[PDB]
Amino acid sequence: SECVLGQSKRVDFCGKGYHLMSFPQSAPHGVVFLHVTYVPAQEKNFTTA
Amino acid sequence: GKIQDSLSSALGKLQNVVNQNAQALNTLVKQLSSNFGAISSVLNDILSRLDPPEAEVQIDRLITGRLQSLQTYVTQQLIRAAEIRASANLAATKMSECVLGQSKRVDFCGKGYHLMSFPQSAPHGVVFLHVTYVPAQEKNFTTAPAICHDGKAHFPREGVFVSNGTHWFVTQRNFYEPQIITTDNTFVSGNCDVVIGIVNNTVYDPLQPELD
Amino acid sequence: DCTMYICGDSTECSNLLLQYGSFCTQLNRALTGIAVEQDKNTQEVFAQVKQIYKTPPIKDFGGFNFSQILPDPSKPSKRSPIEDLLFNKVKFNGLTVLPPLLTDEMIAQYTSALLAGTITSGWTFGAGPALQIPFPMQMAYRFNGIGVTQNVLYENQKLIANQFNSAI
Amino acid sequence: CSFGGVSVITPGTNTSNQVAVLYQGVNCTEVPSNVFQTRAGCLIGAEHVNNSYECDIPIGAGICASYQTQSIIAYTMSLGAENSVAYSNNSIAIPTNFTISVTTEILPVSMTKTSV
Amino acid sequence: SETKCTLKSFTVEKGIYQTSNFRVQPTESIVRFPNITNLCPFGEVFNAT
Ligand SMILES: *[C@@H]1O[C@H](CO)[C@@H](O[C@@H]2O[C@H](CO)[C@@H](O)[C@H](O)[C@H]2NC(C)=O)[C@H](O)[C@H]1NC(C)=O
Ligand SMILES: *[C@@H]1O[C@H](CO)[C@@H](O[C@@H]2O[C@H](CO)[C@@H](O)[C@H](O)[C@H]2NC(C)=O)[C@H](O)[C@H]1NC(C)=O
Ligand SMILES: *[C@@H]1O[C@H](CO)[C@@H](O[C@@H]2O[C@H](CO)[C@@H](O)[C@H](O)[C@H]2NC(C)=O)[C@H](O)[C@H]1NC(C)=O
Ligand SMILES: *[C@@H]1O[C@H](CO)[C@@H](O[C@@H]2O[C@H](CO)[C@@H](O)[C@H](O)[C@H]2NC(C)=O)[C@H](O)[C@H]1NC(C)=O
Ligand SMILES: *[C@@H]1O[C@H](CO)[C@@H](O[C@@H]2O[C@H](CO)[C@@H](O)[C@H](O)[C@H]2NC(C)=O)[C@H](O)[C@H]1NC(C)=O
Ligand SMILES: *[C@@H]1O[C@H](CO)[C@@H](O[C@@H]2O[C@H](CO)[C@@H](O)[C@H](O)[C@H]2NC(C)=O)[C@H](O)[C@H]1NC(C)=O
Ligand SMILES: *[C@@H]1O[C@H](CO)[C@@H](O[C@@H]2O[C@H](CO)[C@@H](O)[C@H](O)[C@H]2NC(C)=O)[C@H](O)[C@H]1NC(C)=O
Ligand SMILES: *[C@@H]1O[C@H](CO)[C@@H](O)[C@H](O)[C@H]1NC(C)=O
Ligand SMILES: *[C@@H]1O[C@H](CO)[C@@H](O)[C@H](O)[C@H]1NC(C)=O
Ligand SMILES: *[C@@H]1O[C@H](CO)[C@@H](O)[C@H](O)[C@H]1NC(C)=O
Ligand SMILES: *[C@@H]1O[C@H](CO)[C@@H](O)[C@H](O)[C@H]1NC(C)=O
């Protein structure tokens, strides 16, 4: 309901990172969720105020 | 007004827990009339046609059976209570998140977009009345991701660019309410040759005429 | 079958076991409840969709490529490539195995419809009628939901689509 | 041998007194009209149709029964309607109205406290 | 009627009910065995000198 039919803001409920979207696949007696997330990269430091 | 009709004319989840408990309590009492391999089911019948050395062996056969049956009753109640406990834990979370708040979780407080919830008490449980918003009566338009104007690319601040066939407007995404594209409801970033799907159209400046 | 596991054919056993009351009726009720719960588990996970949605015959999704997870038309089961990989990795004395109510063809057909709903309508089919939107614009709506400004998607569309494709 | 449970399918005595019978995972040639073989056993007293409806009484392996066409029939359940989204690379649908809907949800919180 | 008896009621509501069992029946008893054999004399056990 919450990761395939919508976008979640709950932390770590749909993978690591900021949840973008999720796709379901059927397994024998089970389900597999492929979670697509956004992960930030290559940071620089700055002065701030 | 329709909840009232549909109920007055559905509480199976509450009926089932009542039925299960009664069906178990009856099976417990109906076991007080089995022999388990004895001469009768009555202690006043083994204590009346047997001497004490022979009635011990027949009383123990009843004791073992009745202990087994009582302990089976007590195991199945632990397993049924662990399931009622999880249901009540979900009801306590729905009372917090749908009645004292507005939830954004999809399909947690009804089907649609949650507006509000109302609780009602039931015999051994709770009924939630979920009020949600459902969109209706859709039309198609044609879209673009950005608008090119003066060599710049414009994106909507909080909407979508749509076209009724010949003209270009901005709406909000869930309710159709078109507006003229101006520099107050769009923002600029970059030149209009890296986005794919840009269309050419004029972005209206409110100061430029009015001042002049 | 409690009686056939215990006694088992013999008749001297059945009359002796009749003396224990309803011990075997309780056990069959307990096992039948479990078996009825297993179908409701699957109905609650997979039958979460009103209609059986289909993807259009083109695959113009903004450079995004979903071919490894869409159904395979050249198969009796119509599973996808990854659902085929997952399915290759996983009578007695009164004992019996009942079949599930849903075939796994039906389960694969529920999952492909959930997939085509998402790729074509975003999140609108989960709250009502499915409203089509182009995939790049839906991806840009989702970038807003994590707090990134939506030109970051449109100016990096090709790179973002390549990264998705390599991760898949 | 072929031992197995016997189940009775009824539309409810407040509708009819006809009945169908499932011999579970028994080959339908060794049971002792409509005899129909299922992946779940041999069904007697229901006719097999070619339509597909929403599931009514679940038989198993995709087969359901209903009191429609009476008597008892067999078939393969229906997953649901069929909706076809007119997706394109530059088309959008936007709603022009709404409905306010209200639904119910029932939950057990307690059971009876017994002592022995 | 077998359903009404299984439920112990006079009104059954719609559903599906397990009512009994079907068990094929076996006829005749074939007793197989081996060929060769003798009368196996006990006349040297009970009649020894
Ligand atoms: C931002 O600057 C900080 C220093 O203020 C960097 O942390 C230094 O990192 C180097 C290399 O890993 C270490 O040897 C130093 O000991 C760190 N400084 C301190 C005070 O511990 C940090 O790596 C910089 N990050 C970026 C993205 O530039
Ligand atoms: C949006 O436009 C599409 C494109 O025509 C409409 O979908 C078609 O509708 C006709 C008539 O209902 C069908 O015969 C086609 O099969 C549909 N799909 C196509 C052409 O790909 C749709 O009705 C429009 N939606 C709204 C809300 O007006
Ligand atoms: C798209 O909407 C515009 C509304 O801005 C329509 O254009 C106007 O239509 C009204 C009534 O027909 C006229 O009085 C105006 O002169 C038109 N122009 C403007 C600038 O307002 C246009 O007809 C619509 N197009 C379609 C295909 O429905
Ligand atoms: C959108 O507007 C720009 C600028 O008005 C158009 O760019 C011109 O296109 C013509 C025809 O291809 C060329 O001859 C000019 O040299 C272009 N000028 C510039 C500054 O690029 C652009 O073609 C328009 N887009 C569409 C689809 O009509
Ligand atoms: C989607 O990705 C698949 C890869 O998983 C592409 O199929 C492969 O394409 C390469 C060349 O691009 C071939 O060498 C492989 O044999 C293909 N594998 C197959 C067909 O199973 C597929 O072409 C991509 N889709 C699009 C539209 O490009
Ligand atoms: C939005 O939908 C409502 C219905 O939910 C429309 O209002 C109905 O209009 C019809 C015809 O005028 C009346 O017979 C009904 O009594 C109205 N319903 C109610 C609850 O008042 C409304 O007209 C629609 N709006 C638009 C712009 O289409
Ligand atoms: C031991 O020898 C005696 C003597 O023959 C056997 O007695 C014979 O038994 C059979 C069967 O009971 C009779 O038909 C004969 O008439 C008996 N013979 C006599 C002379 O009376 C006896 O059976 C032998 N013991 C065993 C174990 O075979
Ligand atoms: C959309 O697809 C059409 C093909 O009909 C193509 O001509 C056009 O360039 C495409 N536009 C975008 C933005 O993908
Ligand atoms: C049950 O019987 C009553 C009266 O005989 C009738 O009103 C009701 O519709 C019946 N229920 C069904 C499901 O047919
Ligand atoms: C039942 O037995 C017949 C005779 O061998 C066979 O043809 C048939 O396939 C059997 N039933 C099933 C379901 O295989
Ligand atoms: C159902 O359709 C199939 C098509 O292959 C046909 O062979 C069969 O006779 C049909 N069944 C009935 C009962 O008409």
Side-chain angles (χ1 to χ4, degrees):
Chain A
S1 262
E2 280 172 35
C3 312
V4 173
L5 302 180
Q7 207 192 354
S8 212
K9 311 283 128 43
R10 299 174 58 183
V11 173
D12 288 328
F13 190 59
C14 299
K16 226 260 209 57
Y18 303 112
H19 183 236
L20 291 172
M21 66 207 314
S22 293
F23 304 117
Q25 301 277 87
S26 50
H29 286 311
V31 66
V32 174
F33 288 112
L34 310 182
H35 307 309
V36 185
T37 65
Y38 174 110
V39 183
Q42 303 183 23
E43 73 272 4
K44 313 311 167 206
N45 27 38
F46 301 100
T47 313
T48 199
Chain B
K2 283 182 304 157
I3 299 291
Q4 153 177 346
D5 299 358
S6 100
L7 293 180
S8 145
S9 84
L11 310 168
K13 275 147 75 84
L14 294 189
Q15 204 57 61
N16 289 337
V17 3
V18 169
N19 286 345
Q20 282 167 61
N21 290 161
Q23 168 91 74
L25 255 201
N26 259 67
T27 291
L28 188 61
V29 178
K30 243 82 168 291
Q31 292 282 97
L32 283 191
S33 102
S34 308
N35 303 164
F36 311 105
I39 61 204
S40 66
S41 297
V42 203
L43 297 183
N44 282 17
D45 286 32
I46 317 199
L47 295 170
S48 100
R49 28 179 164 103
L50 271 189
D51 36 13
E54 273 46 52
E56 269 220 10
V57 205
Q58 300 290 115
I59 286 177
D60 254 32
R61 277 326 90 196
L62 285 188
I63 277 187
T64 275
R66 291 174 178 183
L67 253 174
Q68 204 166 320
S69 64
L70 196 52
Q71 122 203 339
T72 284
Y73 176 78
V74 169
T75 290
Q76 288 206 116
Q77 291 285 282
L78 291 172
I79 290 171
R80 203 175 273 123
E83 166 186 5
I84 284 266
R85 172 70 183 165
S87 192
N89 273 346
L90 185 78
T93 296
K94 278 172 194 286
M95 187 77 83
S96 277
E97 292 187 33
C98 313
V99 170
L100 321 167
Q102 203 189 4
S103 196
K104 288 280 241 298
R105 311 214 243 153
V106 178
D107 287 358
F108 183 69
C109 315
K111 173 147 280 281
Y113 298 114
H114 185 240
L115 296 166
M116 61 207 307
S117 275
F118 303 117
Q120 303 277 268
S121 56
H124 269 109
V126 61
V127 178
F128 295 107
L129 300 188
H130 297 302
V131 178
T132 72
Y133 178 104
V134 188
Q137 279 169 52
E138 60 269 19
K139 268 64 171 160
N140 21 49
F141 315 86
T142 98
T143 27
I147 300 275
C148 175
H149 175 75
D150 282 9
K152 308 188 235 62
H154 305 255
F155 309 85
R157 265 175 208 188
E158 38 230 40
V160 243
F161 290 138
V162 277
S163 174
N164 77 353
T166 33
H167 292 256
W168 281 98
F169 306 100
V170 227
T171 42
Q172 34 155 319
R173 305 154 151 158
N174 306 106
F175 190 80
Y176 183 62
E177 188 189 81
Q179 313 276 109
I180 283 132
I181 303 157
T182 70
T183 67
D184 287 318
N185 48 23
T186 55
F187 66 95
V188 186
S189 107
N191 67 144
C192 63
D193 55 12
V194 49
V195 183
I196 75 194
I198 359 95
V199 306
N200 277 347
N201 209 77
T202 175
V203 184
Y204 162 83
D205 200 334
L207 184 121
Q208 249 42 81
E210 178 266 278
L211 190 68
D212 313 351
Chain C
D1 189 11
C2 185
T3 308
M4 199 181 158
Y5 173 84
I6 311 202
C7 285
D9 212 45
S10 87
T11 3
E12 349 309 75
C13 189
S14 323
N15 289 308
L16 293 174
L17 176 63
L18 227 39
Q19 284 290 273
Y20 274 85
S22 72
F23 272 157
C24 289
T25 281
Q26 303 185 49
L27 295 161
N28 284 303
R29 254 205 302 269
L31 285 184
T32 297
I34 293 179
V36 151
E37 182 215 83
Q38 302 321 290
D39 291 339
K40 179 195 48 66
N41 287 351
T42 304
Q43 211 89 243
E44 267 150 25
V45 170
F46 288 105
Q48 284 210 29
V49 85
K50 324 183 274 130
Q51 319 236 303
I52 298 285
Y53 298 111
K54 301 209 172 192
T55 32
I58 46 89
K59 297 294 155 188
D60 190 350
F61 293 127
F64 289 80
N65 188 21
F66 302 109
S67 65
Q68 296 299 83
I69 53 160
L70 291 164
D72 221 298
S74 87
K75 261 156 208 36
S77 65
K78 305 293 206 47
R79 293 201 279 262
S80 65
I82 295 205
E83 270 159 349
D84 286 337
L85 287 184
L86 297 158
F87 270 77
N88 301 342
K89 293 207 63 189
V90 176
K91 312 206 82 32
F92 266 158
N93 328 82
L95 321 172
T96 187
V97 178
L98 301 320
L101 173 58
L102 290 180
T103 310
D104 54 23
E105 265 225 30
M106 291 170 175
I107 293 166
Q109 195 186 343
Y110 273 130
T111 66
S112 73
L114 281 159
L115 239 145
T118 316
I119 291 175
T120 296
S121 321
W123 54 56
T124 68
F125 83 113
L131 314 157
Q132 83 266 10
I133 175 167
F135 191 80
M137 301 191 32
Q138 187 221 294
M139 214 57 230
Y141 282 20
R142 291 180 190 274
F143 264 54
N144 268 333
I146 65 169
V148 181
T149 251
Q150 82 179 351
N151 40 85
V152 178
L153 179 118
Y154 289 128
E155 295 162 357
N156 297 100
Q157 195 171 144
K158 311 239 187 222
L159 161 84
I160 293 171
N162 288 338
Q163 299 191 248
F164 174 74
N165 291 329
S166 318
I168 277 300
Chain D
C1 315
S2 290
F3 71 78
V6 177
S7 308
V8 171
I9 296 95
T10 162
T13 34
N14 189 16
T15 290
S16 170
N17 283 252
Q18 310 183 64
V19 131
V21 177
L22 176 77
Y23 294 85
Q24 304 196 61
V26 170
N27 197 359
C28 195
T29 83
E30 65 214 11
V31 167
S33 177
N34 305 127
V35 306
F36 170 45
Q37 182 86 238
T38 303
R39 170 89 220 285
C42 161
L43 193 57
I44 304 170
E47 49 165 312
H48 187 223
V49 301
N50 258 349
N51 301 259
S52 319
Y53 311 84
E54 182 215 5
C55 191
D56 202 352
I57 300 160
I59 305 312
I63 303 292
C64 315
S66 216
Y67 180 64
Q68 178 195 299
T69 297
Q70 304 325 72
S71 43
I72 328 279
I73 45 180
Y75 56 79
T76 346
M77 46 156 305
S78 181
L79 292 189
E82 225 312 349
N83 168 237
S84 219
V85 208
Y87 173 89
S88 92
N89 76 0
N90 84 342
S91 203
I92 198 156
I94 295 153
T96 58
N97 214 348
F98 47 84
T99 90
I100 297 302
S101 84
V102 10
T103 68
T104 75
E105 172 163 28
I106 293 103
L107 288 120
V109 331
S110 32
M111 65 197 218
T112 47
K113 315 147 80 178
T114 76
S115 191
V116 304
Chain E
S1 305
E2 196 166 31
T3 294
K4 283 175 185 165
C5 223
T6 322
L7 294 173
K8 297 191 48 61
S9 169
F10 273 55
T11 58
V12 40
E13 49 210 38
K14 60 176 307 202
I16 178 185
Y17 305 89
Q18 242 241 69
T19 241
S20 95
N21 308 249
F22 168 72
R23 248 245 292 315
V24 173
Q25 288 305 14
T27 82
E28 89 237 47
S29 71
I30 63 100
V31 175
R32 271 270 116 179
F33 267 139
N35 250 334
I36 301 292
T37 20
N38 28 339
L39 193 54
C40 205
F42 277 143
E44 64 259 7
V45 189
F46 298 94
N47 270 341
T49 172

